[PDB]
Scaffold this active site. Sequence first.
Site, mmCIF file in Angstrom:
data_model
loop_
_atom_site.group_PDB
_atom_site.id
_atom_site.type_symbol
_atom_site.label_atom_id
_atom_site.label_comp_id
_atom_site.label_asym_id
_atom_site.label_seq_id
_atom_site.Cartn_x
_atom_site.Cartn_y
_atom_site.Cartn_z
ATOM 1 N N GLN A 184 0.814 -1.242 0.000
ATOM 2 C CA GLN A 184 0.000 0.000 0.000
ATOM 3 C C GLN A 184 0.822 1.254 0.000
ATOM 4 O O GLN A 184 0.291 2.359 -0.281
ATOM 5 C CB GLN A 184 -0.992 0.003 1.152
ATOM 6 C CG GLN A 184 -0.283 0.177 2.515
ATOM 7 C CD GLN A 184 -1.256 -0.011 3.626
ATOM 8 O OE1 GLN A 184 -1.599 -1.084 4.070
ATOM 9 N NE2 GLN A 184 -1.795 1.161 4.079
ATOM 10 N N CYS A 217 -5.240 0.503 3.328
ATOM 11 C CA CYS A 217 -5.308 -0.917 3.733
ATOM 12 C C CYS A 217 -6.688 -1.510 3.489
ATOM 13 O O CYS A 217 -6.777 -2.706 3.117
ATOM 14 C CB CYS A 217 -4.947 -1.059 5.201
ATOM 15 S SG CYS A 217 -6.049 -0.086 6.327
ATOM 16 N N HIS A 273 -6.588 -1.064 11.335
ATOM 17 C CA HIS A 273 -5.906 -1.556 10.149
ATOM 18 C C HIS A 273 -6.735 -2.667 9.554
ATOM 19 O O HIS A 273 -7.246 -3.537 10.299
ATOM 20 C CB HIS A 273 -4.492 -2.081 10.542
ATOM 21 C CG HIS A 273 -3.624 -2.398 9.400
ATOM 22 N ND1 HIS A 273 -3.342 -1.467 8.398
ATOM 23 C CD2 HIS A 273 -2.907 -3.531 9.144
ATOM 24 C CE1 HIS A 273 -2.542 -2.111 7.566
ATOM 25 N NE2 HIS A 273 -2.271 -3.366 7.938
ATOM 26 N N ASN A 283 -1.005 -9.270 4.995
ATOM 27 C CA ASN A 283 -0.964 -7.843 5.136
ATOM 28 C C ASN A 283 -0.688 -7.209 3.712
ATOM 29 O O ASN A 283 -0.560 -7.968 2.716
ATOM 30 C CB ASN A 283 0.122 -7.466 6.165
ATOM 31 C CG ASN A 283 0.008 -6.113 6.754
ATOM 32 O OD1 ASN A 283 -0.863 -5.323 6.445
ATOM 33 N ND2 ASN A 283 0.878 -5.840 7.741
#
Length: 219
Positions: free
Chosen positions: A19, A25, A163, A186
Amino acid sequence: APRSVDWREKGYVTPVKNQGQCGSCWAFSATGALEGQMFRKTGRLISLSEQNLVDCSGPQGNEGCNGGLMDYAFQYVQDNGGLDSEESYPYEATEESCKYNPKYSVANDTGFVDIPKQEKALMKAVATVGPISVAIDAGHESFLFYKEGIYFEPDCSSEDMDHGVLVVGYGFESTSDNNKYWLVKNSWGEEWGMGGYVKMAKDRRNHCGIASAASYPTV
Ligand SMILES: *C(=N)c1nc(N2CCOCC2)nc(N(Cc2cn3ccccc3n2)C2CCCC2)n1
């Protein structure tokens, strides 16, 4: 539910993305969930455009690089009638004017499902659906500098998440005690964590709020 699941093994999961310095995110979490559901539907794994979500989903409540929510992204895709491929609409890491083109749409959705706020419900969803979008409390340096093993942060909140990430499976470490984890993708690139993944503690009192705002798109 099986004792472990890893949807990467089944073809559901694109490589780890990055990102950059943008609060997007939520867009990566949403593309990951819809990548998985489109794969279940069609048998084709196609990387989707986060940039399309960042640039275009303001009406649904998202704020570009200032954050947003996966459910708002899933509502945009339904309202819009589509979402472009990553190839057609590559990631820029800054909020820009909307450039959606339907010619290059490769995904669609019909809404979304919010999973009950419990780890057993999350486990059943992961086992029966595919990858699941989740929000976590990532706001500790222990997460920023996570390298390997089961992440357990005694100061983590189960109610205040900051997040958005993607649960791609769950399992256990063979090794001692309290050894179960969620396998989490992630959006911080491959060099963070375990190839871009974090094993998140599972069945430890909804650690870091992983089951508090979990959802997936219907397709
Ligand atoms: C993900 N990169 C990310 N970034 C942020 N930021 C906080 C604001 O400034 C930049 C980084 N926030 C999140 N959140 C919280 C959040 C932010 N917004 C804005 C509009 C609507 C909802 C919303 N939530 C997470 C996104 C998914 C779970 C919380 N994430």
